[PDB]
Structures are given as C-alpha cells and as structure tokens.
Amino acid sequence: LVQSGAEVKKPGSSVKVSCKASGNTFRKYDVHWVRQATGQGLEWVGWMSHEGDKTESAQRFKGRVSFTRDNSASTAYIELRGLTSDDTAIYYCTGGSKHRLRDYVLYDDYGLINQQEWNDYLEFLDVWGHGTAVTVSSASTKGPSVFPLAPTAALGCLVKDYFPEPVTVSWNSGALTSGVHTFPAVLQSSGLYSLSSVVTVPSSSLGTQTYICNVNHKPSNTKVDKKVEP
Amino acid sequence: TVVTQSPLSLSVTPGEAASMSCTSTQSLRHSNGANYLAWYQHKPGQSPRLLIRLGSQRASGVPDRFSGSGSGTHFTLKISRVEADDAAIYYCMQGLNRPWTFGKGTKLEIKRTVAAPSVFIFPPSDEQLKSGTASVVCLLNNFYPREAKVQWKVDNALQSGNSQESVTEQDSKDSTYSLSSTLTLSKADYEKHKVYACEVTHQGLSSPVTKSFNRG
C-alpha cells in the first residue's frame, strides 16, 4: 500500500497519515495501524472495519487517536494527538482478516432472537505498507556538515548535525559496494543527528585510487560529494 | 492479557533448527477450536511479513521450514535449516481478546566463529576544528559476537559518558558486526591534551587493543 511521507511535528501537535489501497482492498480487508519506535518493537495502535461499524484503539491511544476513511472508500487516515517524543515511530497501515462470530444468542418464546452478541477476532495482518516515519522534536530542518575521516587502511565521512532523518551515503556514486559500512545515526543532546560512513581499502591504493562519498539529506536539499584523502 | 516471547535472542548456526515460544496468560483458543495467534517476521528497514496464522497455518510464500504450533496458552515457532536470510525479529500476535497485543519479539542472529575486530582511529578534521567542536571516531570492523567494549582515553584518562557508539545490523555475507564510537570534545579542551587512544575489548583478542594518535 501507498502511505504518505515522513512528517515532523512539535511536541503536543497532531499528525494525520494517509494510506491507499489497490482497487477495493479496503473492503475485502480491515484497516489497521502498527508502529515501531526506536528501542521498541511492533505495537498495534488501532483499527477500523471495512464494514464500517467498529473503530477501536489500543489503551494508550484512547482519547488521542481518530481513525477515519475517505468515503470514496479509497483512503484511510489516522490522527494522533498529545504528541510525545515516545510517539516517534514508523507508522504502518495494513490490511487485516477478522472473524465476525456470534458467541451468545438467546431466542424468545416466539423463536425470534431476544439477545445476541457478535465479536470480531483478529486472524492476521497482511498486505503492509512502507511505513510513515513521524519525528516528534523541537529542532528544525538542518543540512548536515560533512567531515573527512583520514588516517590496509580505513577512511570515510562524518555527517554531523542534521535534522531530521534520513540521510543516504553512497560511495564513488555507487561504484563501491564493497568494504563499506554505514552506521545507525545517533541522536545528540542538540536534538540533531550524527552518522558515520567508512570504507576499508588497502593502503597501496590510497595514492592511486579515488574515494568520494556521496551524501544526500533530502529534508533540507543538502547534497554533498566529499572526497576523502589522508 | 499479556503474551511473552522467549528467548529474547537466538544464536543459530546456519542449517540448524531454531525453536521459539509465545506464552499467553489467558487462553487464545476460541470456542471453535481455532487458536488466534499469528507469527510475523520483521527484517530491519522493511515491512513486517506474516508467516504463520491461526497457530499452525502458513501464508502464501512461507516455506514449510517455518512451522506454527501450539494451542491454548503455549505456542511455538520453529525454523528448520536456517539461512542467513532468516536472521530477523519474529513477532507473535494474539487476536482473541481485546485489545489485540503484539509480542515483545525474539531476535534471531546467525551463529558464527569468533572474529576479532580491526580497530582504527580518526582525529578531528581541521575543517571541523574551525567550528569549536572536535569529534574523534574509533572504528570497530567485522567482529563477532556483537559484545564489545570501547574505552576512550585522553592523556591516559578514562573517558566515560561523553562518547556515543552504534553498531551495524549483522552482515549478510560474513555474519559480523561493526561499531562506530564518537568521542566529542570542545576545540579548547581538545587542545589541552595530546594522546587520544581507543582501547577495544573483544573476546576475539588475547589482550585489549588500543589505537592512539597524538596532536601533531
């Protein structure tokens, strides 16, 4: 499925995230939302039934979320509020298979149904989306500063103080997919990120060979081709 | 109703069995004899994939090495003849009681022979030093297992609480890890000291490995 793109929000604002289905996947399937924070795992958030008669959330989100759909049937929308930095995660919309079952029934003297209760049971979540990352922070957009790392040897680039994520780091414009290592970024006390990318080459080639790391921070239109020599 | 996975992490030599377990407090078996516990895999930077539904049934594409099992409160995912492609975090999810809850997850990593890291040290660039900040980086390269400790030392003084490290996900080819630690310092305090060392400790080494440099 095709979700909307990454969003950045100040603590206490609201986010609305989109999801789109292929044809009528949203009436053969129920619509859910799962997230995953930094040190967290998969966490169900809420759901909304294709029949349209049930909308429920996880406990933590009661009072904060609102799950609506476009009544052209095409688009799903989640809205989250009271935003903490804990609500910084990748948000996945997905389909679901529920079993609507009758668990209780009671018939009257006339044979009619006097009492009944139907319940939904989750069988599986399938056809997932690509995840819409939400960053709840105080900082603003910031192009990174790229610094050289210089001394069989090692060398690389240092991508310093950017916001938000992500940042890609290619080497030799894609010619080098060997001996490279690009690490997870770390979140600094500045509220900004810093990532490192290196490559391991033999020193006999340091004078002969060229090594240009390609850095692209799309949120702030910062693209840098930095050449690394000792 | 809480469901808990065990163990937290798995170490499997490729081509071996891997057995996990999801255990729930209340029972997950609906009165129709259907257990509502699904299994999912999640490889990093990717969307999670369903592999086992209704306790034992497999979804479209899941090889028969992944076998769902169990009933009631005791379920079990089993990966037989694991490959490097199967290192991931596997999540069980109950679907009987509201609210529906995911599991804590069980991480699977490839067991390997012990590999020591190759250590490198990078002084701050002169480019960076004009900004008032200095960033020294220590590189840990292609080691296994993941457990490793770096100790920053400035003029033979153990630094603690001022650095920041980060490890890569397990490599698909050699099943190793790599760590990057960044000691940060002011341009003023960088210039008060001469020796910057990086003492790496890993079970692949006989003794700890220190990689140093001197200002100038």
Author numbering:
A (entry chain H): 4 to 52, 52A, 52B, 52C, 53 to 65, 68 to 82, 82A, 82B, ...
B (entry chain L): 2 to 27, 27A, 27B, 27C, 27D, 27E, 28 to 212
Q: What does the primary publication say about this deposited structure?
A:
Here, we solved X-ray structures of unliganded PGT143 and PGT144 Fabs, and they too exhibit the β-hairpin HCDR3 motif as expected. Structural examination revealed that HCDR3 makes extensive intra- and inter-CDR contacts in PGT145-family Fabs. In our four Fab structures, Y32LCDR1 hydrogen bonded with the π-nitrogen of conserved H98HCDR3. We found a 52aH-D/E-X-D/Q53 motif in HCDR2 that appeared to stabilize the HCDR3 stalk. PGT143-PGT145 and PGDM1400 all contained extensive electrostatic interactions between the HCDR2 and 3, such as the interaction between R99HCDR3 with D53HCDR2 (Q53 in PGDM1403-6) and D100rHCDR3. The HCDR3 stalk is structurally conserved across the PGT145 family yet primarily interacts with a single glycan at N160. The stalk, stabilized by tertiary and quaternary interactions with the other CDR loops, serves as a platform to insert the somewhat variable tip of the β-hairpin into the glycan-shielded trimer apex. Therefore the structural and sequence analysis reveals that the evolution of these types of antibodies is driven by somatic hypermutation in which substitutions stabilize an extended HCDR, thereby reducing the entropy for binding antigen.
Some of the most potent bnAbs target a quaternary epitope at the apex of the surface HIV envelope (Env) trimer. In this manner, the trimer apex forms an immunogenic, structurally conserved motif consisting of an electropositive hole surrounded by N-linked glycans. Apex bnAbs discovered so far can be grouped according to their heavy chain (HC) complementarity determining region (CDR) 3 topology: (1) PG9-like with—or predicted to have—a hammerhead motif (Doria-Rose et al., 2015, Doria-Rose et al., 2014, Gorman et al., 2016, McLellan et al., 2011, Pancera et al., 2013); or (2) PGT145-like with a long, anti-parallel β-hairpin (McLellan et al., 2011, Sok et al., 2014). The elongated HCDR3 conformation of this PGT145-class bnAbs results in a paratope that projects a long distance away from the surface of the Fab and enables epitope recognition at the C3 axis of the trimer apex via a long-range interaction (Sok et al., 2014).
